[PDB]
């Protein structure tokens, strides 16, 4: 069962991304050969500022490598280096009823929040179907809002298979509901669109600003504090084993220590936890030639698989 | 010396109406125009996914146009799918294409109006066509009224792109070719495949004999003078005859003593001799695939160099 994950290059990774998905992805690499790609063609649907898009791609590559993606075990590349996905995209469009795409909620949702009503935004799910189907993907790890896109991919595969014979694997979404939802600085679900994030690859000065923004109770410094509902505790939990959690909890219930101290402590836990990844990340961005090499290594492996599939597709479509 | 670009998407068998109505003009434009012509095989995928047939149609189309006069040395002639850059450009242009432009395309509207369901491919092809045009800095796109809106769409995309990124694309213009003398079919009506009134270029002599035999004549006795002004044999023969050739035929008509059966026999001789070289070349290109490939490969290298230069500029703007 091939697992394939496309990764958005847009924006800074935050601890919610890390504990909610990335860590699981990294720890799954010994279980099977996993496929992961930075989806920079898809990033063009929300911006055409090339200088920014290009840096976003480099940074995303460096972030995921530094967080534990192993290019030896896995197949990790930049979407735009394997150009076969473009041709399959066009071929798959001949099998995609407009009806299927007009219904898609993701286009409506993105338009409603201000994105441009463009052909690229509308066509987003077809290109993603090409990503999935080109590599005979069985399982697509996604957030809940990308489930329908995977479903669209499958519907397309069914239409192709019905016409051409069983040439595509039928993909299914995998969402993990087991995972804790990481609260942001305001108490709501941590997300970039809420600007309530604690970012992984920021300077200590920047991280301090973020942690300081965390909303808390009005409870006096002297009085016992409720750990169960405290955002700081809730985030600290991510960095603490059983004893450390209890030790912090005990500081909460004693009084004489304030949330300002708890924030100081959280800064320490966060800086220490991602210390190694941050240095690796800055190290990769400092010498971009090594990053290009890692990405090229990954592309070579993905391209071989893509080229094998395209040869079969070429037979069916007459290329 | 403005660049003229035409995508070619033939269907069924080519007939003398396609030839004298469009192809000859295109062939003759080569010496004094900068002509780019491609077999639009990506676009043919919108109405068929029968790969076996699609592959053959492409080979036949390339062989046919080469046989009838496309000069690979003078012009740039290639198979669309050999220059893959066009797919990448198509995706980039989609980001600059508002939905309303494509929703208003008649090719999509007409389909939905007659009840049918449309594929994303049908909806999206004006964008791919815009990529075809813009990739090569086309100034002039020779098209049928059919296609005017598509060129306008390509023009709107280019303007949007240029507004965002600078001088990236040349603004293309449609050229409707006017107003070419219609070719009469075997039945008196305009020759067309829909009517089954055609005379085909690359058929067997048996099939040509059959088509010519079907030409509608008048009931005039064998020996009597024939009226060349109303005769479809004569009207069709004119295409293959110079002014004094027609005159010699017309004398034969006015003289009498020769029947329409004999004029049809004559018409066969004219058509077979006129296309003899093209047919032999056509068949040769299909029987020895390597020769056609060499020619298509050459065309593709000339077009690809231009496409690569455009993409280098595009890459700087989109971050690739
Ligand atoms: N606050 C969060 N808590 C748990 N998981 C999260 C959180 N934010 C993102 N994820 C995970 O990361 C993925 C979605 O990332 P994404 O939506 O692009 O980032 P963002 O939160 O900024 O909007 C999903 O797998 C989701 O499970
Ligand atoms: N009878 C004709 N006389 C003049 N030109 C023609 C004729 N039939 C076709 N053409 C030319 O050939 C081109 C393609 O026509 P096409 O759609 O292949 O014909 P049909 O109606 O047989 O399908 C047109 O752009 C037109 O200019
Ligand atoms: N749409 C995905 C990114 C993506 C692109 N192609 C994919 C293929 C498979 C899985 C995910 C993707 C996201 O928003 O995160
Ligand atoms: N759409 C054209 C063929 C075509 C594809 N791309 C083009 C670019 C320019 C001119 C024509 C084309 C037709 O139906 O005949
Ligand atoms: Na978000
Ligand atoms: Na017709």
A with B: how many residue pairs have Cβ under 8 Å apart? Answer: 128
Q: Distance, in angstroms, between A47 CA and closest chain B CA?
A: 9
From the list A189, A208, A234, A280, the catalytic residue is A189
Q: Are B131 and A104 in contact (CB under 8 A)?
A: no
Residue of B80, B41, B83, B82 whose CA lies nearest to B58: B41
Q: Are B10 and B57 in contact (CB under 8 A)?
A: yes
Q: Distance, in angstroms, between A319 CA and closest chain B CA?
A: 6
The H or E element spanning position B34 is strand B34-39
Q: Are B233 and B220 in contact (CB under 8 A)?
A: no
CB hemisphere CA count around A61 (13 angstroms): 29
Round to whole Å and give the CA distance between A1 and B12: 45
Asked if the Cβ–Cβ distance from B87 to A86 is below 8 Å, we say yes
- The 3-state secondary structure of B125-180 reads HHHHHHHHHHHCCCCEEECCHHHHHHHHHHHHHHHHHHHHHCCCCCCCEEECCCCC
Asked if the Cβ–Cβ distance from B120 to A127 is below 8 Å, we say no
Asked if the Cβ–Cβ distance from B87 to A91 is below 8 Å, we say no
Name the closest residue on chain A to residue B57, using Cα atoms.
A318
Q: Are B211 and B204 in contact (CB under 8 A)?
A: no
Output the CA–CA distances (angstroms, integers) from residue B316 to A10, A288, B86, B312, in the order listed.
19, 17, 17, 7
Candidate of B192, B194, B196, B239 to mutate for ligand 2, largest count of ligand atoms within 8 Å of Cβ: B192
Our answer to whether residue B160 is catalytic in this structure is no
Sheet strands side by side (includes A75-78):
A4-7, A35-38, A75-78
Residue A314: its chain B contacts at CB < 8 A? Answer: 51
Output the CA–CA distances (angstroms, integers) from residue B9 to A265, A284, B28, in the order listed.
70, 49, 19
Residue A110: its chain B contacts at CB < 8 A? Answer: none
From the list B24, B74, B160, B190, the catalytic residue is B190
CATH of span A2-183+288-319: 3.40.50.620
Q: Are B119 and A96 in contact (CB under 8 A)?
A: yes
- From first CA to last CA, the distance across chain A in angstroms is 29
Q: How far is the CA of A200 from the centre of ligand 1 (A)?
A: 13
Asked if the Cβ–Cβ distance from A317 to B54 is below 8 Å, we say yes
Interface membership of B80 toward A (CB under 8 Å): no
Backbone angles phi, psi at A35, to 5 degrees: -110, 125
Residue of B61, B62, B57 whose CA lies nearest to B45: B57
Interface membership of B156 toward A (CB under 8 Å): no
Angle at alpha carbon of residue A302, lines to A173 and B120, rounded to 5°: 55
The H or E element spanning position B5 is strand B3-8
- The 3-state secondary structure of B245-306 reads HHHHHHHHHHHCCCCHHHHHHHHHHHHHHHCHHHHHHHHHHHHCHHHHHHHHHHHHHHHHHH
Backbone angles phi, psi at A37, to 5 degrees: -140, 140
Q: Are A78 and A54 in contact (CB under 8 A)?
A: no
Output the CA–CA distances (angstroms, integers) from residue A227 to A20, B106, B138, in the order listed.
22, 64, 68
Write the DSSP symbol of residue A104. -
Residue of A136, A115, A112, A138 whose CA lies nearest to A42: A115
Write the DSSP symbol of residue A81. G
Q: How far is the CA of B23 from the centre of ligand 2 (A)?
A: 10
Sheet strands side by side (includes B140-142):
B76-79, B34-39, B3-8, B140-142, B173-175
Task: Give B94's contacts (C-beta < 8 A, 6+ positions apart).
Answer: A118, A119, A120, A123, B124, B127
Nearest ligand to the C-alpha of residue B190?
2
Round to whole Å and give the CA distance between A271 and A275: 6
From the list B160, B193, B281, B302, the catalytic residue is B193
Interface membership of A165 toward B (CB under 8 Å): no
Asked if the Cβ–Cβ distance from B124 to A93 is below 8 Å, we say yes
Residue of A146, A145, A147, A129 whose CA lies nearest to A137: A129
Point out which residues pair with A97 in neighbouring strands. B119
Nearest ligand to the C-alpha of residue B36?
4
Interface membership of A300 toward B (CB under 8 Å): no
Residue A182 Cβ contacting ligand 1 at under 6 Å: yes
Q: Are B122 and B107 in contact (CB under 8 A)?
A: yes
Point out which residues pair with B200 in neighbouring strands. B15
Our answer to whether residue B193 is catalytic in this structure is yes
Cβ neighbourhood burial of B307 (10 Å; 0-12, 13-18, 19+): buried
Strand ranges (DSSP E) for chain A?
4-7, 35-38, 75-78, 139-141, 172-174
Asked if the Cβ–Cβ distance from B119 to A127 is below 8 Å, we say no
Nearest residue (CA) to ligand 3, atom 9: A6
Round to whole Å and give the CA distance between B285 and B64: 9
Name the closest residue on chain B to residue A90, using Cα atoms.
B121
What is the location of CATH 1.10.240.10 in chain B? 185-288
Query: What fold does the segment set A184-287 form as a domain?
Result: Tyrosyl-Transfer RNA Synthetase (1.10.240)
Ramachandran region of residue A114, left (φ > 0), alpha (ψ -120 to 50) or beta?
left
Point out which residues pair with A76 in neighbouring strands. A36
What is the location of CATH 3.40.50.620 in chain A? 2-183+288-319
Q: Are A191 and A10 in contact (CB under 8 A)?
A: no
Nearest to B98 among A57, A117, A126 (CB): A117
* Ion ligand 5, residue ranges at CB < 5 A: A 191-193
Cβ neighbourhood burial of B115 (10 Å; 0-12, 13-18, 19+): exposed
Q: How far is the CA of A10 from the centre of ligand 1 (A)?
A: 13
Angle at alpha carbon of residue A158, lines to A155 and A162, rounded to 5°: 145
Residue B194 Cβ contacting ligand 2 at under 6 Å: yes
Three-state secondary structure call for residue B39: strand
Candidate of A3, A8, A15, A17 to mutate for ligand 1, largest count of ligand atoms within 8 Å of Cβ: A17
What is the location of CATH 3.40.50.620 in chain B? 1-184+289-320
Three-state secondary structure call for residue A217: coil
Write the DSSP symbol of residue B116. -
Q: Distance, in angstroms, between A87 CA and closest chain B CA?
A: 6
Round to whole Å and give the CA distance between A168 and A155: 11
What is the location of CATH 1.10.240.10 in chain A? 184-287
Cβ neighbourhood burial of A216 (10 Å; 0-12, 13-18, 19+): middle
* The architecture CATH gives domain B1-184+289-320: 3-Layer(aba) Sandwich (3.40)
Angle at alpha carbon of residue B259, lines to B258 and B263, rounded to 5°: 85
CATH of span B185-288: 1.10.240.10
Asked if the Cβ–Cβ distance from B118 to A97 is below 8 Å, we say yes
Q: Are B9 and B46 in contact (CB under 8 A)?
A: no
From the list B24, B74, B111, B235, the catalytic residue is B111
């Amino acid at each position: 069962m091939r697992v394939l994950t496309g990764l958005q290059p847009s924006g800074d990774l935050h601890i919610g991304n890390y504990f909610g998905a990335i860590k699981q992805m990294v720890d799954a690499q010994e279980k099977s050969q996993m496929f992961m790609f930075i989806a920079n063609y898809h990033a063009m649907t929300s911006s055409q500022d090339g200088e920014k898009l290009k840096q976003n791609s480099l940074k995303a590559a460096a972030a995921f490598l530094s967080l534990g993606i192993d290019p030896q075990k896995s197949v990790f590349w930049l979407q735009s280096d394997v150009k076969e996905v473009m041709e399959l995209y066009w071929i798959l469009s001949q099998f995609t009823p407009m009806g299927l795409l007009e219904r898609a909620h993701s286009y409506k949702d993105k338009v409603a929040k201000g994105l441009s009503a463009s052909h690229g935004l509308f066509s987003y799910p077809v290109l993603m179907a090409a990503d999935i189907l080109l590599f005979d993907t069985r399982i697509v790890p996604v957030g809940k809002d990308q489930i329908q896109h995977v479903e669209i991919a499958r519907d397309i595969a069914l239409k192709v298979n019905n016409e051409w014979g069983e040439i595509f694997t039928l993909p299914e979404a995998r969402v993990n509901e087991e995972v804790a939802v990481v609260v942001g600085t305001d108490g709501a679900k941590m997300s970039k669109s809420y600007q309530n994030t604690i970012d992984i690859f920021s300077s200590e000065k920047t991280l301090k600003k973020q942690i300081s923004s965390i909303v808390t109770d009005s409870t006096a410094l002297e009085d016992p504090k409720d750990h169960e509902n405290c955002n700081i505790f809730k985030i600290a939990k991510l960095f603490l084993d059983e004893s450390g959690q209890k030790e912090l909890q005990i500081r909460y219930e004693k009084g004489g220590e304030g949330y300002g101290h708890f924030k100081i402590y959280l800064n320490e836990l966060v800086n220490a936890y991602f210390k190694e990844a941050r240095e690796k990340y800055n190290e990769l961005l400092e010498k971009p030639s090594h990053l290009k090499e890692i990405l090229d290594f990954g592309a070579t492996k993905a391209r071989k698989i893509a080229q094998e599939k395209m040869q079969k597709i070429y037979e069916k479509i007459g290329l």
